[PDB]
C-alpha cells in the first residue's frame, strides 16, 4: 500500500527564522 | 487520584515513571511523578501547557495531571517501547519499509506539531515512543517550545544549535529526524560526539564541511567555530543500501542550511515515501523481544 501525501537578522536566517514564519503566525 | 500503581519503570533528571491502571476503565497509563519552593516543576507545567493544546496520533497524549503541594504526577498513554531499544537490538532487522514507516510517523507528528507552531527540541530514538500497535509518538515535551514569535541531545543536535542558534525553526527537529534516520540505517549512533566540538567535527568529517553556498550566514551564529575542509564521505558510501530516493531524503534532511533543509511537509512530499515499497503498517513493525 503506497503512501500518498494529504494536506529577520542574519542570525535568525542562519538558524532558520526567515521573518515569514512570524508573518504567517501573526 | 483514581490510578493504581502496577510497575516502576525508571528515574531521570526530572521525574520517575510508573506503569499504572485507571480503576474506572482498566486502562494502562504511564504516571510521571516529578521528583525548591519555586512551586510545581516548570518542566511538568511546560509539558501540561503544550500537550493540552495538541491532538494527533503521532504526539503523546496527556491524559491527566494530579498531585499535592508542589508535587505533581502526569498521566500519559502507556508506550511499550522506544526507537532506541529498536535500534540497539541486534535481533531485529530494519528493512527499508520499517525505516520508511518510522520516518513517516515521525514526520507526520512533526508536521502537525510545527503547524501548531511548536518545536519538540528533544528528538532522539528514546524520545520516539512506540506502543503495542506500532504507532510512533513524539514524547518528552519537557523541552518543547512554541516557535514563530521573535537543546537536543549532542548526538542529534543540529549544527545551527551546536553553533549557538538562539532563534531557529523546524530544522532543529528535521536534523534530528535525519540523525535518527541515519541511526536507523546504521544501527549505531550516526554522529556520536563527546563535546560540542567533537560533534561538529564528526558532522563535518562525515557530511563535508559546509561552505557559504550550502549555508549562507553560517558564520553569524554566536558559537561559530570554523573547522577544516573535510570532503565528506559520499552519502551512497555511508548508506550503501540506500536507494536514490532515500538518498535524496537523507540529503534534504541533512542540508546544512536550515531554511533549505526540508520541512516536515515537503519531506512528506518527497518521492521516497510515495515510491515502492510503501511504508509497512504499524501493526507489522518490529517489536523488541
Ligand atoms: C513519556 C511518557 C511518560 C511515557 C509513556 N510510556 N512510557 C514508558 N513506557 C515503558 C518504556 C518505554 C520506553 C523504553 C522502555 C520502557 N520500559 C518498559 C519497561 C521498563 N522500561 N517509559 C517511560 O520512561 C521510561 C524510559 C526511561 C525512564 N524511565 C522509564 N516513559 C513513558
Residue numbers in the entry:
A (entry chain H): 244 to 250, 278 to 296
B (entry chain J): 10 to 44, 51 to 165, 173 to 311
Q: What wording appears in the published article?
A:
The human CDK-activating kinase (CAK) is a heterotrimeric protein complex formed by CDK7, cyclin H, and MAT1 and acts as a master regulator of cell growth and division. It regulates transcription initiation and the cell cycle by phosphorylating RNA polymerase II and cyclin-dependent kinases, respectively. Here, we use high-resolution cryo-EM to determine structures of the CDK-activating kinase, a master regulator of cell growth and division, in its free and nucleotide-bound states and in complex with 15 inhibitors at up to 1.8 Å resolution. Our structures provide detailed insight into inhibitor interactions and networks of water molecules in the active site of cyclin-dependent kinase 7 and provide insights into the mechanisms contributing to inhibitor selectivity, thereby providing the basis for rational design of next-generation therapeutics.
Furthermore, as a proof of concept for high-resolution structure determination of inhibitor-bound CAK, we re-determined the structure of CAK modified by the covalent inhibitor THZ1, which has been shown to disrupt super-enhancer transcription in human cancer cell lines, and we determined the structure of CAK in complex with the high-affinity inhibitor LDC4297, a pyrazolotriazine-class compound that exhibits anti-viral activity, a property that is of particular interest given current global health challenges. In contrast to THZ1, which acts via a covalent mechanism, LDC4297 is a highly selective reversible inhibitor of CDK74. The map quality of our structure of CAK in complex with LDC4297 at 2.1 Å resolution was improved by locally refining only the approximately 40 kDa CDK7 density. The structure reveals that the substituted phenyl ring assumes a similar conformation to the equivalent group in ICEC0942, while the ether-linked piperidine group was refined into a boat-like conformation, though structural flexibility and sampling of other conformations cannot be excluded. The bound ICEC-series compounds exploit hydrogen bonding interactions with the backbone amide and carbonyl of CDK7 residue M94 in the hinge region that are shared between all compounds, leading to a relatively well-preserved positioning of the pyrazolopyrimidine core within the CDK7 active site. These interactions are also exploited by other hinge-binding kinase inhibitors, including the CDK7 inhibitors THZ1 and LDC4297 (see above). Notably, LDC4297, which is highly specific for CDK7, carries an even more bulky substituent at its ring-up benzylamine group, and the recently reported CDK7-selective compound LGR676840 exploits a bulky biphenyl substituent at this position.
